[PDB]
Design a protein around this ligand. Structure first.
Ligand code: FAD
Ligand SMILES: *[C@@H]1O[C@H](CO)[C@@H](O[C@@H]2O[C@H](CO)[C@@H](O)[C@H](O)[C@H]2NC(C)=O)[C@H](O)[C@H]1NC(C)=O
Ligand SMILES: *[C@@H]1O[C@H](CO)[C@@H](O[C@@H]2O[C@H](CO)[C@@H](O)[C@H](O)[C@H]2NC(C)=O)[C@H](O)[C@H]1NC(C)=O
Ligand SMILES: *[C@@H]1O[C@H](CO)[C@@H](O[C@H]2O[C@H](CO)[C@@H](O)[C@H](O)[C@H]2NC(C)=O)[C@H](O)[C@H]1NC(C)=O
Ligand code: 246
Ligand code: NAG
Ligand code: NAG
Length: 496
């Protein structure tokens, strides 16, 4: 027997089973794994979400797991619902009204539907002279999707990840109950969902903190051949003083074998800059080159430009990058934030976007980053042609709420390490997948206590180690409270 509200979804054509629908919801950005769902739900309102979830909760024996597809940027099927129901979240935003993104009247925050993509949140915020303070490097991800992970970029060191910049949320638990939560109301759900990997319920609305939107960003890259100086400077730039003037701090690693190509692919360096850096590398006989990428946000004020030069000159004076290897660009704030979009378009038309992405994303404690550099950047990755950026930058644990579901290393400072390998060559995927296992194995043997990010584990012991025994028990307690039937986001392979 089908509940009335559930059948209604079928009648209205919102609950589809056609091969076209199931196929679209069976693959993701990873392009590595696939799983066809039994049906796809195209909700037009959050009421449709309650119907499905309420049905599953009241219907004994309900065999359909449910996933919430944001934009499917998951790497290993975390958004799939094998033989179940995949909710096409984007459908919640088809209606030209009511709006799915509303900047508060006081301009202190912006309400965004969970299905909304950050690029749109940005545009709707800029319209009101404000903007979220913590981003992701790529803006075509959903609010609910990044919040179910953490949401990190070069601003997280001072504003924390996106999950640390949410005032409250509307969540529909695995029981089918609509619940508004925050640090004051239903905090137990609020904390569980943030970094919760879609295990406790679906986020239909997230209240995102905003700050006055800067007009431009002074964009700089500093080059190093010495990892010690590179990491020391990234830490100096992101160390609590209150923080330094930098609005964003990230870093890149360039292996010597493909130095010129990767430097050119940054879209930042000119061929003249590339030549200088390649020469520098040879002079120092470096097998790896490092680049700090940082920005200084600022407004159109008449003195802004001059003030920026002085602030930047001052900050750079505290650093140790190779003399004369500071490279500057100055762009509109939005242009910087959406800087990766241009890369996607190019790669896609070139047929290099819709390919396997055996990406390795992890958090490495500061005390072992130098060891990671030696074993990975100067070790495992040496002797290979790298297509895709190798991103490395420090984060401050103080800006992360351990009470939430997201797991992080125990040290005060840890690095986000993102090796965005693209299986561009024919069937080069197997090598890359093996390489990532080798990197993780290297870390396990060196005793490096890392945390993976946006990655799913297929073994319970791994998820327990990921969260930590105590934090795991907490995760289970919340799972038993918000999704006892273990139906939500089975693709994470935590309870499925
Ligand atoms: C493809 C990609 C991803 C990416 C990135 C660049 C690219 C090209 N750059 C990132 C960055 O700089 N920083 C960062 O923190 N993440 C970055 N990502 C990774 C991205 O955060 C994850 O892919 C994330 O999953 C969000 O992507 P998306 O919005 O597309 O979500 P999904 O893949 O479809 O789903 C992820 C899991 O979350 C659950 N889910 C999704 N929406 C909801 C809601 N609204 N409520 C509760 N759960 C939700 C799914 O069920 C799934 O388990
Ligand atoms: C954005 O603000 C609008 C107010 O204009 C909200 O619209 C209301 O939404 C509820 C439920 O979603 C409806 O019952 C009302 O009829 C809507 N009123 C209007 C004016 O259309 C909308 O919910 C808000 N969305 C966000 C971002 O939370
Ligand atoms: C960095 O990689 C370059 C290759 O791009 C190495 O240079 C090559 O060295 C071999 C051995 O002498 C020559 O046969 C090639 O012609 C060189 N490539 C060119 C044309 O530049 C370089 O040795 C590597 N540096 C380090 C420290 O590993
Ligand atoms: C330039 O850098 C390379 C790589 O770091 C140095 O390493 C080479 O010499 C080492 C000493 O015998 C060998 O153990 C390495 O295998 C060899 N590099 C490889 C893998 O070919 C090299 O000594 C440096 N140049 C010098 C001598 O200053
Ligand atoms: O994709 C990222 N940057 C995309 C990018 C940045 C700069 C140049 C080119 C691509 N970063 C990132 C971080 C954490 N998790 C994931 Cl899955 C990805
Ligand atoms: C990977 O992408 C290609 C090209 O779109 C597609 O043909 C293939 O089915 C995808 N495989 C997976 C596992 O998604
Ligand atoms: C910054 O200046 C540019 C050009 O003068 C203008 O288009 C933009 O709207 C300004 N930013 C603000 C305050 O919106």
């Amino acid at each position: 027997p089908w509940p009335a509200s559930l059948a209604a979804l079928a009648l209205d054509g919102k609950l589809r089973t056609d091969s076209n629908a199931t196929a679209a919801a069976s693959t993701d950005f990873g392009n590595i794994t696939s799983a066809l769902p039994a049906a796809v739900l195209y909700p037009s309102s959050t009421a449709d979400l309650v119907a499905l979830l309420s049905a599953a909760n009241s219907t004994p024996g309900w065999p359909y797991t449910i996933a919430f597809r944001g934009r499917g940027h998951s790497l290993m099927g975390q958004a799939f619902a094998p033989g179940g129901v995949v909710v096409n979240m984007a459908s919640l935003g088809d209606a030209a009204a009511p709006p799915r993104i509303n900047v508060s009247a006081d301009g202190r925050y912006v309400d965004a539907g969970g299905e909304q993509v950050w690029i749109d949140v940005l545009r709707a915020s800029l319209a009101r002279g404000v903007a979220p303070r913590s981003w992701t490097d790529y803006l075509y991800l959903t609010v609910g999707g990044t919040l179910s992970n953490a949401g990190i970029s070069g601003q997280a060191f001072r504003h924390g990840p996106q999950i640390s910049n949410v005032l409250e949320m509307d969540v529909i638990t695995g029981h089918g109950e609509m619940v508004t939560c925050s640090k004051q109301l239903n905090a137990d759900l609020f904390d569980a969902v943030l970094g919760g990997l879609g295990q406790f319920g679906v986020i239909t609305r997230a209240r995102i903190a905003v700050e006055p939107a800067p007009a431009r960003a002074r964009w700089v890259r500093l080059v190093y051949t010495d990892f010690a100086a590179f990491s020391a400077d990234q830490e100096r730039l992101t160390a609590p003083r209150s923080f330094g003037p930098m609005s964003y701090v990230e870093g890149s690693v360039f292996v010597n074998q493909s130095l010129a190509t990767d430097l050119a692919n940054t879209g930042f360096f000119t061929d003249a800059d590339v030549a200088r850096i390649v020469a520098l590398a040879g002079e120092r006989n470096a097998t790896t080159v490092y680049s700090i990428e940082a920005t200084l946000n600022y407004d159109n004020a008449t003195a802004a430009a001059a003030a920026v030069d002085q602030e930047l000159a001052s900050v750079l004076g505290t650093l140790s990058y190779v003399e004369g290897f500071a490279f500057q660009r100055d762009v509109a704030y939005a242009a910087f934030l959406d800087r990766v979009h241009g890369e996607e378009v190019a790669l896609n038309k070139l047929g290099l976007w819709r390919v396997p992405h055996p990406w390795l994303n992890m958090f490495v404690p500061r005390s072992r980053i130098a060891d990671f550099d030696r074993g990975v950047f100067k070790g495992i990755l040496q002797g290979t042609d790298i297509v895709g950026p190798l991103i490395v930058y420090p984060l401050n644990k103080s800006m992360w709420d351990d009470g939430m579901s997201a797991a992080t290393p125990s040290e005060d400072v840890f690095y986000a390490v993102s090796l965005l390998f693209s299986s561009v060559a024919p069937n080069d995927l197997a090598r890359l997948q093996e390489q990532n296992r080798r990197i993780l194995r290297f870390c396990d043997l060196a005793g490096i206590q890392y945390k993976t990010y946006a990655a799913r584990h297929t073994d319970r012991s791994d998820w327990v180690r990921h969260f930590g025994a105590a934090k795991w028990n907490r995760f289970v307690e919340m799972k038993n409270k918000y999704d006892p039937k273990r139906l939500l986001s089975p693709g994470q392979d935590i309870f499925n």
